[PDB]
């Protein structure tokens, strides 16, 4: 078949869009007349000398902005800002219309956006710089739709989603072929958790432009993850990596996470689990040979090293991530959770409970941190406190599928005795969730259910005891057999009772 | 081990929030959208020559609904004769 790569959509496009759009050499006419100069961006192009030459020759603003874009690709954000400023100082822009000055103001706006993005810090200062540049551009030329796109992006960064959505509605009124408007709308919808609504926009943008940056396939894979079709997500991410093999390590990280999830939830045997887990570790390490300080990779490796009893290195990585990415609360929550898990072996119940609470406060979506908090409450013999916390969490999250939480609730209520009905409900929910997940149902839940049903239904209790015995197999104990025999004796099953007693 | 099983169930669900770095959109990222002032319009009109057919078959497979039938005509107004 036809190879799926960047060259595929290169050949799909006409040769005008193939070579010219990716030229690394810029042709600049000279002020002397027909003389021109060609400077290759592969070589080390100096910003100051190039700007001085451009000002002397008074070249078209397109060349200035193209050089700025290339220096952006080089990462020279300061150099691109210098290019923009000296272009504003150039005679061409001063003698041109206000439209060119507005376009360069919007370019400086994009420069501020990239400076904020590349650092994820000083957000207010760069946002103010970008806002001032965008306001100047709009005042100089308000008819440019790029000013509206910049306004919408500014609203999105300040979480003014309604105004950005209105701006994208206006852009859709102007034209429905605007790819950037589609991307911004889909980003806002994903931020608003409208995964499917953003997914239609992702598909439309991908169909319109398969070579558009940012990659729509990243959002499509996120939606497939939200729609459980993670296999298609991985396939689309592989296609994106083929199209974008550079500066897209996040796709490889997502692929590694998907492989780890598949290994956890699909390995049919221990040997297959080991093979898949080691392959995922090798792929993660190969990605780490490019970047060795990525906080998410360290957090992921912390799980493996905690499972390897390397708690000291887990603490080192957690502290390093906390120092680097304290802005991200999710990393703080994960580090606190791992510190509490490490201290659990040390049984620092007060310290582990405090760490679990801090993890919950950092990121409330971390259910595991709350479950560890409840477990630590149990460790400190806080039966009532753990019960109250668990009831609060369940009543706030009645739709959450925390099977172990429901099992613990059932056990606590069985110990209480008076709340047997909630215990039955929670144990049945745990049984159903385990059956849906194809996970081994704990026979202890069956024993608790039989104990509860002793005073309600001997038939259901006996059936649950039989199910627990079938799960145990050779693990049947003396108490289970004695209770089965007593059940059959009460059922007048003399033969079965005698066999169970034997 | 109960918390380990809970982690395995959860895996890295809530850790994908930071991975949204691909959602950010910047104009300068595209190489050829800026080389001319109207390169945006040219590239928006460069893909009008392309369609779903020109998409790669594997990328077409990525277009999954979240075939024509012979008995559903498209309406007309002048007919023929």
């Amino acid at each position: 078949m036809s190879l799926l790569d960047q060259d595929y959509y290169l050949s799909a496009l006409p040769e005008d869009k193939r070579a010219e759009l990716v030229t690394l050499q810029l042709t600049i006419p000279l002020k002397s007349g027909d003389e021109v100069v060609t400077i290759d961006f592969n070589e080390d192009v100096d910003v100051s000398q190039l700007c001085v030459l451009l000002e002397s020759e008074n070249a078209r603003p397109d060349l200035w902005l193209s050089a700025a874009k290339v220096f952006v690709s080089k990462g020279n954000i300061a150099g691109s800002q210098e290019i923009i400023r000296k272009a504003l100082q150039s005679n061409v822009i001063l003698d041109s219309s206000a439209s060119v000055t507005s376009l360069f103001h919007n370019f400086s706006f994009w420069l501020s956006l990239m400076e904020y993005v590349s650092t994820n810090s000083r957000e207010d200062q760069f946002l103010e710089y970008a806002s001032n540049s965008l306001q100047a551009s709009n005042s100089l030329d308000s008819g440019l739709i790029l000013n509206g796109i910049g306004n919408g992006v500014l609203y999105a960064k300040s979480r003014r989603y309604d105004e950005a959505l209105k701006e994208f509605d206006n852009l859709l009124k102007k034209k429905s072929t605007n790819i950037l408007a589609i991307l911004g709308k889909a980003q806002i919808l994903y931020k608003r958790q409208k995964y499917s609504q953003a997914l239609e926009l992702y598909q439309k943008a991908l169909t319109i432009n398969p070579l558009i940056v940012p990659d729509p396939r990243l959002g499509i894979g996120l939606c497939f993850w939200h729609l459980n079709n993670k296999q298609l997500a991985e396939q689309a991410w592989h296609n994106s990596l083929k199209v974008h093999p550079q500066n897209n390590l996040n796709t490889k990280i997502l692929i590694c996470l998907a492989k780890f999830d598949y290994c956890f939830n699909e390995s049919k045997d221990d040997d297959e689990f080991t093979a898949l887990y080691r392959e995922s570790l090798e792929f993660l390490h190969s990605c780490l040979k490019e970047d060795a300080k990525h906080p998410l990779l360290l957090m992921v490796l912390a799980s493996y090293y905690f499972s390897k009893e390397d708690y000291e290195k887990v603490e080192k990585l957690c502290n390093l991530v906390l120092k680097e990415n304290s802005r991200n609360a999710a990393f703080v929550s994960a580090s606190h959770f791992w510190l509490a898990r490490v201290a659990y072996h040390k049984e620092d119940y007060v310290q582990a409970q405090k760490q679990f609470k801090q993890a919950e406060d950092s990121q409330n979506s971390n259910t595991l941190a709350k479950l560890g908090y409840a477990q630590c409450l149990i460790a400190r013999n806080e039966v009532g406190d753990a019960t109250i916390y668990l009831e609060k969490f369940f009543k706030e999250n009645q739709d959450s599928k925390s099977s172990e939480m429901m099992l613990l609730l059932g056990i606590i209520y069985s110990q209480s005795g008076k709340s047997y009905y909630k215990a039955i409900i929670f144990l049945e929910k745990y049984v159903a969730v385990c059956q849906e997940e194809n996970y081994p149902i704990l026979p202890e839940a069956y024993l608790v259910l039989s104990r509860v049903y002793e005073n309600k239904d001997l038939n259901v209790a006996l059936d649950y005891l039989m199910k627990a015995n079938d799960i145990l197999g050779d693990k049947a104990n003396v108490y289970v057999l004695n209770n089965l025999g007593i059940y059959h004796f009460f059922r007048n099953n003399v033969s079965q009772s005698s066999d169970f007693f034997a | 081990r109960l918390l380990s099983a809970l982690f395995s169930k959860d895996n890295f669900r809530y850790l994908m929030n930071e991975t949204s770095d691909g959602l950010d959109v910047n104009y300068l990222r595209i190489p050829g959208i800026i080389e001319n002032e109207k390169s945006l319009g040219k590239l928006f009109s460069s893909y009008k020559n392309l369609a779903i057919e020109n998409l790669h078959p594997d990328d077409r497979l990525l277009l999954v609904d979240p075939s024509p039938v012979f008995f559903l005509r498209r309406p007309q107004y002048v007919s023929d004769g």
Binding site: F264, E266, S267, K268, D269, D270, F273, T274, Y277, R278, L281, E282, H285, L288, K289, A292, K293, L301, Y304, S307, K308, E309, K313, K316, L317, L320, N438, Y439, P440 | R1, L2, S4, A5, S8
Partner: peptide
């Protein structure tokens, strides 16, 4: 039988021991 075959140590809770049985050397900075 794949429904019963998949039930093994990691599902039973011996996942940590399995990871301990998998040894790998990283180029750790810390």
């Amino acid at each position: 039988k794949l429904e019963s075959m998949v039930k093994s140590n990691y599902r039973n809770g011996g996942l940590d021991r399995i990871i301990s049985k998998i040894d790998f050397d990283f180029d750790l900075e810390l």
